[PDB]
Amino acid sequence: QVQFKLVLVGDGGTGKTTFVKRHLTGESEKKYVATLGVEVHPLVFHTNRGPIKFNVWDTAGQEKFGGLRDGYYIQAQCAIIMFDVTSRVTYKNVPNWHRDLVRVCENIPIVLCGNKVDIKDRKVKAKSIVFHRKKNLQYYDISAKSNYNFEKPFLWLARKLIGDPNLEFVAMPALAPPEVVMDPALAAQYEHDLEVAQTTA
């Protein structure tokens, strides 16, 4: 079986828990790791190369009070770093998370996600999002509550880890229905801004 430990980090309140919980089977089959206060969510995705499982490590909030213990990071094979696009400070803390992660895990594949893009009053915009370009990281706007771009971080990571640029998901996993609407007009614009910013340097 093909599985990877995926550590999910970022400032408290960025929506890491909401995000991982979108995946319904991941939620029903999650395992509690008492020693570390961690819930591990097995997220299966079906690709043209077979099933791939991301065991996503989600905190129980300890990140609000300081860095995470080494055991949390140990043996991680990939990661997502999340910040809140409606909170400049969460973006500002991103470098710290990268540092801590990399001190333990090194050059593992990492996706940077700006969450909560369903919100009209957006603080951290595409042209300000620059950390990923510096460190080799891929970026995606996401909205956990609307399922927007939910699958993109996992697809990029699967491609990187298997070493197959043509890897595809045969179908989307069963997800919790969108709690908020992600405006299609918005999603169109936010995608344009990102593209342009990526060609800005």
């Binding site: 430990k5 395992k31 790791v33 020693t35 570390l36 065991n55 055991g71 140990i74 043996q75």
Partner: peptide, 27 residues
């Protein structure tokens, strides 16, 4: 000799009498 941890699913070596990540015993 490697074993998967029943508690957190991390793959460990046989030389480890408990999980490098969560410290859980090897079955």
């Amino acid at each position: 000799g490697s074993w998967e941890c029943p508690v957190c699913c991390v793959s460990n070596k046989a030389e480890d009498s408990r999980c490098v990540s969560c410290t859980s015993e090897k079955p």
